[PDB]
Amino acid sequence: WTATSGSCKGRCFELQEVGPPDCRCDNLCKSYSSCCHDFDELCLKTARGWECTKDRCGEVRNEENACHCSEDCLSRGDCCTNYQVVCKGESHWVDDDCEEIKVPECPAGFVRPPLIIFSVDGFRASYMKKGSKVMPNIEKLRSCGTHAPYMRPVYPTKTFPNLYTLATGLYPESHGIVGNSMYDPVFDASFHLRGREKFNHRWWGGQPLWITATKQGVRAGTFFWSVSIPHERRILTILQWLSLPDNERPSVYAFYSEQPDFSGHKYGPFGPEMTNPLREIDKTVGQLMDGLKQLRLHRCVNVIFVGDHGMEDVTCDRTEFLSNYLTNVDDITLVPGTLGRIRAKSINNSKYDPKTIIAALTCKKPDQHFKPYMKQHLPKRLHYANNRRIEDIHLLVDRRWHVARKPLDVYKKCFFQGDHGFDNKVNSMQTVFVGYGPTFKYRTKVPPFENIELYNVMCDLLGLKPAPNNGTHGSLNHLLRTNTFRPTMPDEVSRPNYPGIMYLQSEFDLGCTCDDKVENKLEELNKRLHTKGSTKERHLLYGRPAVLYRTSYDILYHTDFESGYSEIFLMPLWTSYTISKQAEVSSIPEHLTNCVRPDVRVSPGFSQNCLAYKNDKQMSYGFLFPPYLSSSPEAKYDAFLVTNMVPMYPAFKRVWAYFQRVLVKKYASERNGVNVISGPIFDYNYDGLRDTEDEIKQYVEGSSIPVPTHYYSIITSCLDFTQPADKCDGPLSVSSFILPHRPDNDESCNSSEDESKWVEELMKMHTARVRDIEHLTGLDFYRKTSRSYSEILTLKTYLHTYESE
């Protein structure tokens, strides 16, 4: 119930919410149907429109007008935004020369530069170039401020997940807004774009920026704008709040535009109808900037111009139907469109079987335009699994397509020509970032970065301590003139043991054999020196990784590689080696095919054994340092140490062997040497974080050898590829992956073919940031470089995406 008989007189766009059944005058009142009877009349004035004209200059104030051109409007704070231009011979902001803002130039009483977040829905990254002739205000912000060529959204590349990620710094799996439509089985409640459940606070997790600010004594404007409030009124409202007394005035504000997304859905990302929405958004930006200039705030406020996601060409004809794959289509509920999520229609149907649904959707038609996954098998870079609102069965839809349950859903719901929601590495899904103001840099281009990083920066801009989030605080310091955050490297928790030769060969009963009993003071000292670390500078280029949790591990040195060997997990946590451009690839000799050698530095009790692999009919083994890349036939023996062995399904060995035998050398030849760090990952609870031992669900049969869920590699070289990886004086270049350790290659529809036709495609899909691997291993890389720590943080957030320009 709402008693709508009170009044908004003096209360229009009041900042604090009053509680039912009292009548409201804030932004949300319309969305709850709770506004006072006179809200429209008093608070949504339109008379005479949004612009001063010459005849209005110096007019007698008429309070009915939407905005004012009377002499008293500046002190009231309610001039039309072009007042000074029309009536006082001032220039529009866009027509002024760019001039560096070296310090905040603010009115007296301003404690800090305000922040205005100007969010545009569906604003694809390439609009900045492609729409540049029609967006002069935006283009000035971009060229004079700090900009990225694009900003990476989160998956799914839909509005609510991305706006809430911008507000929180969290992945959707952690903030809980995992789609624009959701079912929460604990709640037994559904969230939709239409209707009321979406207003319930239980959907919205984490701590959004307005809460962070309010808790730390920094006031905030509303972020949500009711759809019926026109853009011109949202801008004037912001500008009126900026005229409040010091003790009442917010320091952080948001504007949202539903354009150009609304038109993009109708017309496609580049429809000729798109030029006008872009012009209209630019005009709105000009209204704000002229408005700020009238308030003497245009060299005071930090403005962020940001999108939520891009827009792709998608039409009704490019729809795949589950009814063409599944016999049982009426026993499922599909969340459809540019992604799929499947669950049982009834929890009382015990004949529902996810395994049979996955198989019925796997590589069934030659050009099939979606791929099914159990959510734990999705690329880890998506961070799209650890939430009960994400269904176990996921469908990754190809760009330009939709998935639906039955054809009738598509014609009983062509209209649309654009959509979005696809994998967040797809070029059409990328969006925009510009920062302009005293705290941002001047005329500066920065590399592309992820939207999860922005919360920390916005906190930095407001002097706030960010709530715990998925940004890497400091990785965006290069965007900022001041207010940088200067973190320390985390402390190493476990220090390594450095074992020498402590065991005789006969103490081992591992069931392993090797043909290695074949015999010099020149080369006896030389191999002692290699086992004590004499080539370590070559193979460990960035210091040893720090172990950030309590465990027991050993550093093992070898001619060709160095490793950190876990006594708990019976394998390396990491294996580091450098391959020069000149390196030669060799074979595993016939006589060494099945060779596994005990490591006399490590106890039998802390070693794997070959018998377990014999007895486990599903599990085989590989090696982390590849025997193919040995520096000499004698060094090759090191690669067959039991301490270099890891458990591998035969299907995965196809992948791994191709990576090690062909791709590593390819990379070294393309990048002028590479340093490779490889290792296992255990994430059985799909939380993105390193498992403890008691979380492992699978061991090599009859042993305590845990089976990884993934294998990673970090492949580092010199950004200036004229210098070799091992003698690089400047910035680094990295690519990484987190490959799923699967017992089949069902993910790869062409896996019956030679590995040259499918393995690299798989590896590209599972590209990763170093930071992703850090979370999954509890390791901290790049501890000893010549580079600044903020630069290294940026490097650790880099994602190699494999998309063209």
Ligand X SMILES: *[C@@H]1O[C@H](CO)[C@@H](O[C@@H]2O[C@H](CO)[C@@H](O[C@@H]3O[C@H](CO[C@H]4O[C@H](CO)[C@@H](O)[C@H](O[C@H]5O[C@H](CO)[C@@H](O)[C@H](O)[C@@H]5O[C@H]5O[C@H](CO)[C@@H](O)[C@H](O)[C@@H]5O)[C@@H]4O)[C@@H](O)[C@H](O[C@H]4O[C@H](CO)[C@@H](O)[C@H](O)[C@@H]4O[C@H]4O[C@H](CO)[C@@H](O)[C@H](O)[C@@H]4O)[C@@H]3O)[C@H](O)[C@H]2NC(C)=O)[C@H](O)[C@H]1NC(C)=O
Ligand Y SMILES: Cc1cc(COc2n[nH]c3c2CCN(C(=O)c2ccc(S(N)(=O)=O)c(F)c2F)CC3)c(C(C)(C)C)cc1Cl
- Residues at the site binding Ca ion, with contacts judged by CB under 5 A: 121, 159, 261, 308, 683, 685, 687, 689, 691
Q: How many residues bind Zn ion (CB under 5 A)?
A: 1
Shortest Cβ 763–Cl ion spacing (Å): 28
Q: Which residue is nearest to Zn ion (CB)?
A: 261
In angstroms, rounded to a whole number, what is the distance separating the alpha carbons of residues 633 and 643?
Answer: 19
Shortest Cβ 193–ligand Y spacing (Å): 5
Using CB under 5 A as the criterion, what x/- string covers residues 314-343 for binding Zn ion?
------------------------------
Shortest Cβ 427–K ion spacing (Å): 42
Using CB under 6 A as the criterion, what x/- string covers residues 186-205 for binding ligand X?
-------------------x
Q: How many residues bind ligand X (CB under 6 A)?
A: 19
Q: Which residue, 261 or 791, has its beta carbon nearer to Zn ion?
A: 261
List the binding residues for Zn(2+). Answer: 121, 159, 261, 265, 308-309, 420
Q: After which residues is the chain broken (C to N over 2.5 A)?
A: 413, 519
In angstroms, rounded to a whole number, what is the distance separating the alpha carbons of residues 359 and 747?
Answer: 11
Contact 571, 594 (CB under 8 A): no
Record the tokens describing residue 50, joined without a space: 């949004």
Interacting residues with ligand X between 388 and 407 (CB under 6 A): 388
In angstroms, rounded to a whole number, what is the distance separating the alpha carbons of residues 263 and 269?
Answer: 8
**Active site (annotated) includes residue 159:** yes
Shortest Cβ 586–K ion spacing (Å): 25
Q: Which residue, 25 or 681, has its beta carbon nearer to Ca ion?
A: 681
Using CB under 5 A as the criterion, what x/- string covers residues 593-622 for binding K ion?
--------------------x--x------
Residue with tokens 């220039």: 91
Q: Which of 139, 261, 726, 791 lies at the binding interface for Zn ion (CB under 5 A)?
A: 261
Q: Which residues bind ligand Y (CB under 6 A)?
A: 117, 119, 121-122, 158-160, 163-164, 166-167, 180, 193, 223-225, 227, 254, 256, 258, 261
Query: Is the preceding omega at residue 468 within 30 degrees of 0, hence cis?
Result: no
Q: Which residue, 185 or 447, has its beta carbon nearer to ligand X?
A: 185
Residue with tokens 């590689």: 561
Count CB-CB contacts under 10 A for residue 494: 16
Contact 180, 193 (CB under 8 A): yes
Reported as type and span, the H/E element at residue 449 is: strand 449-450
In angstroms, rounded to a whole number, what is the distance separating the alpha carbons of residues 714 and 677?
Answer: 5
Residue type, 734: V
Q: Which residue, 168 or 797, has its beta carbon nearer to Cl ion?
A: 168
Long-range (24+ apart) CB contacts under 8 A made by 681-687 are 681/708, 681/709, 681/710, 681/711, 681/712, 681/738, 681/773, 681/776, 681/777, 682/569, 682/706, 682/708, 682/709, 683/380, 683/709, 683/710, 683/776, 684/709, 685/386, 686/375, 686/376, 686/385, 686/386, 687/386
Closest by CA to 252, choosing from 287, 223, 278, is 223
Q: Which residue, 68 or 147, has its beta carbon nearer to ligand Y?
A: 147
DSSP E strands in 698-804: the ranges are 710-718, 732-740, 767-768, 779-780
Which residues, 6 or more positions from 239, have their beta carbon under 8 angstroms from its beta carbon?
77, 78, 81, 288, 291, 292, 295
> Which range binds Zn ion by CB under 5 A, 239-247, 257-265, 480-488, 765-773?
257-265
List the binding residues. Answer: 121, 159, 180, 261, 265, 308-309, 420, 683, 685, 687, 689, 691
Give the CA angle between residues 651, 657, 662 to the nearest 5°. 140
Contact 576, 677 (CB under 8 A): yes
Burial (CB count within 10 angstroms: exposed 0-12, middle 13-18, buried 19+), residue 272 = exposed
Query: Rule CB under 6 A: is residue 468 a binding residue for ligand X?
Result: yes
Q: Which residue, 578 or 751, has its beta carbon nearer to Na ion?
A: 751
Q: Which of 14, 40, 184, 687 lies at the binding interface for ligand X (CB under 6 A)?
A: 687
Shortest Cβ 265–Zn ion spacing (Å): 5
Query: Rule CB under 5 A: is residue 745 a binding residue for Na ion?
Result: yes
In angstroms, rounded to a whole number, what is the distance separating the alpha carbons of residues 737 and 764?
Answer: 8
Shortest Cβ 394–ligand X spacing (Å): 16
Give the CA angle between residues 412, 418, 422 to the nearest 5°. 95
Query: Rule CB under 6 A: is residue 386 a binding residue for ligand X?
Result: yes
Q: Which residue, 185 or 511, has its beta carbon nearer to K ion?
A: 511
> Which range binds ligand X by CB under 6 A, 114-122, 173-181, 217-225, 713-721?
173-181
Query: Rule CB under 5 A: is residue 649 a binding residue for Na ion?
Result: no
Query: Rule CB under 5 A: is residue 153 a binding residue for Cl ion?
Result: no
Alpha-helical regions (H) of 402-469 = 408-411, 454-462
> Residue 691's binding partner, choosing from Ca ion, Cl ion, Na ion, none, with beta-carbon cut-off 5 to 8 A by kind?
Ca ion
> Residue 613's binding partner, choosing from Zn ion, Na ion, K ion, none, with beta-carbon cut-off 5 to 8 A by kind?
K ion
Q: Which residue is nearest to Na ion (CB)?
A: 751
> Which range binds Cl ion by CB under 5 A, 172-180, 296-304, 447-455, 520-528?
172-180
> Residue 119's binding partner, choosing from Ca ion, Zn ion, ligand Y, none, with beta-carbon cut-off 5 to 8 A by kind?
ligand Y
Query: Rule CB under 6 A: is residue 683 a binding residue for ligand X?
Result: no
In angstroms, rounded to a whole number, what is the distance separating the alpha carbons of residues 672 and 666?
Answer: 10
Q: Which of 451, 751, 777, 794 lies at the binding interface for Na ion (CB under 5 A)?
A: 751
Contact 172, 206 (CB under 8 A): no
In angstroms, rounded to a whole number, what is the distance separating the alpha carbons of residues 540 and 726?
Answer: 9
Q: Which residue, 232 or 261, has its beta carbon nearer to Zn ion?
A: 261
Angle between helices 770-777 and 789-797 (to 10 degrees): 90
Q: Which of 174, 263, 430, 439 lies at the binding interface for ligand X (CB under 6 A)?
A: 174
Shortest Cβ 466–ligand Y spacing (Å): 14
Residue 77, Ramachandran bin (φ over 0: left; ψ between -120 and 50: alpha; else beta): left
Residue 27's alpha-carbon distances to 64, 152, 688, 767, in angstroms, are: 20, 30, 38, 42
The DSSP-derived string for 256-282 is EEEEEHHHHHHH-TT-GGGHHHHHHHH
Q: Which of 119, 319, 469, 767 lies at the binding interface for ligand X (CB under 6 A)?
A: 469
> Residue 121's binding partner, choosing from ligand Y, Cl ion, ligand X, none, with beta-carbon cut-off 5 to 8 A by kind?
ligand Y
> Residue 685's binding partner, choosing from ligand X, Ca ion, Na ion, none, with beta-carbon cut-off 5 to 8 A by kind?
Ca ion
Q: Which residue, 48 or 124, has its beta carbon nearer to Ca ion?
A: 124
> Which range binds Na ion by CB under 5 A, 284-292, 418-426, 557-565, 747-755?
747-755
> Which range binds Cl ion by CB under 5 A, 173-181, 286-294, 482-490, 726-734?
173-181
> Residue 751's binding partner, choosing from Na ion, Ca ion, ligand Y, none, with beta-carbon cut-off 5 to 8 A by kind?
Na ion
Q: Which residues pair with 577 in a beta bridge?
A: 676
Query: Rule CB under 6 A: is residue 185 a binding residue for ligand X?
Result: no
Sheet of strand 146-147: strand arrangement: 252-260, 115-121, 302-307, 433-436, 146-147, 444-445
> Residue 175's binding partner, choosing from Ca ion, ligand X, Zn ion, none, with beta-carbon cut-off 5 to 8 A by kind?
ligand X
Shortest Cβ 744–Na ion spacing (Å): 7
Q: Which residue, 383 or 661, has its beta carbon nearer to ligand X?
A: 383
Count CB-CB contacts under 10 A for residue 181: 17
Q: Which residue, 691 or 791, has its beta carbon nearer to Ca ion?
A: 691
Residue 424's alpha-carbon distances to 1, 221, 370, 505, in angstroms, are: 42, 30, 15, 52
Sign of CA dihedral 33, 34, 36, 37: positive
Closest by CA to 389, choosing from 204, 207, 206, 153, is 204
Which residue in 146, 159, 575, 709 is the catalytic one?
A: 159
Catalytic residue list: 159
Under the rule (CB under 5 A), what is the footprint of Cl ion? 179-181
Under the rule (CB under 6 A), what is the footprint of ligand X? 170-171, 173-176, 205-206, 383, 386-388, 468-470, 687-689, 775
Under the rule (CB under 5 A), what is the footprint of Zn ion? 261
Under the rule (CB under 5 A), what is the footprint of K ion? 613, 616
